[PDB]
Amino acid sequence: GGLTCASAPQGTLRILEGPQQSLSGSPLQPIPASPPPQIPPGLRPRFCAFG
Amino acid sequence: ATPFIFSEENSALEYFGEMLKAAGYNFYGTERLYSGISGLELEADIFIGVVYYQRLRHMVSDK
Structure with a gap:
């Protein structure tokens, strides 16, 4: 009436x-x-010479 | 002046020289000076511009 080892798993x-x-x-x-x-x-020059 | 924004194809010198030439100055950034001591126009045209200087904390007054 006890537990016994059964067949080995196949997979x-x-x-x-x-x-x-x-x-x-x-x-x-x-x-x-x-x-x-x-x-x-455009930008333009922001400086001029004298004369 | 972010690094890696201007390549070989788009150069920085090309860009800023175009900016300068658009203001009546010359591409390569050289304006020609006179000698404040002899009063004669030097033979070489000088490279002048605006740069940001820092002043360091090491002074002869402390050393």
Whole structure:
């Protein structure tokens, strides 16, 4: 009436919960790159010679 | 003067020389001076500009 060893298991199942990968879009930056410093339009000379 | 904003294609000297030439000065930043001692226009045109100087805390009065 006691507990005895039974037949060895024939296989093992290991369960884990996993989600999946999306598409590669690689959206690097809101406003991207190093935007260049640049000329103010027209500007004009702010200096003249004497005479 | 942020580092890494001006490349080989867009140079800093090109940019600021265009800025200067747009004000009536010359591209390369050289204006020609006179000698305040002899009164003659020096043969070489000088490189003049505006730069930001700091004054350090080490004075001959303390050393």
